[PDB]
């Protein structure tokens, strides 16, 4: 079973010191587990592991996978919306914060955008509102 707090911060410096020992940046350790698991984790994710910037679970699900790669040797790519579609969308939000799966289709198409990414854009956005202005 996954370790407790008193063991996680320990693995933290162990991984950092033992990492630059075999000469491998966190970014390289990322594409390293790529050719070891089916997919991978970015330089950011690995960074956050080092500085212990992750929840209990998110780090307990990683300690074992990280130690395999170090012990012995060996998800959809994020969509970045162009600022012109980020502003365009902000407007339709400003018209209606929750469009029907129909309107949503009629917007994605009306803008040449994968229907899904849009259904999601409004979701994260609505949640954003709730965080930003209550």
């Amino acid at each position: 079973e996954p370790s407790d707090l008193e063991e996680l911060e320990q693995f933290a410096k162990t991984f950092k010191q033992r990492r630059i020992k075999l000469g491998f940046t966190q970014g390289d350790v990322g594409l390293a587990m790529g050719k070891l698991y089916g997919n991978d984790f970015s330089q950011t994710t690995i960074s956050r592991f080092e500085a212990l910037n992750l929840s209990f679970k998110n780090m307990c699900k990683l300690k074992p996978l990280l130690e395999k790669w170090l012990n012995d040797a060996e998800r959809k790519k994020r969509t970045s919306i162009e600022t012109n579609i980020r502003v365009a969308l902000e407007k339709s939000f400003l018209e209606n914060q929750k469009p029907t799966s129909e309107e949503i289709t009629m917007i994605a198409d009306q803008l040449n955008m994968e229907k899904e990414v849009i259904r999601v854009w409004f979701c994260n956005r609505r949640q954003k509102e709730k965080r930003i202005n209550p």
């Binding site: 707090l5 996680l8 500085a51 910037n53 992750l54 929840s55 209990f56 954003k128 930003i132």
Partner: peptide
């Protein structure tokens, strides 16, 4: 006054440590 548009990790082990110390 930037409100911090963007999401955060709740209870990162980093802060979880500095908490159970003082």
């Amino acid at each position: 006054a930037r409100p911090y548009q963007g999401v955060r990790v709740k209870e990162p082990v980093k802060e979880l440590l500095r908490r159970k110390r003082g």
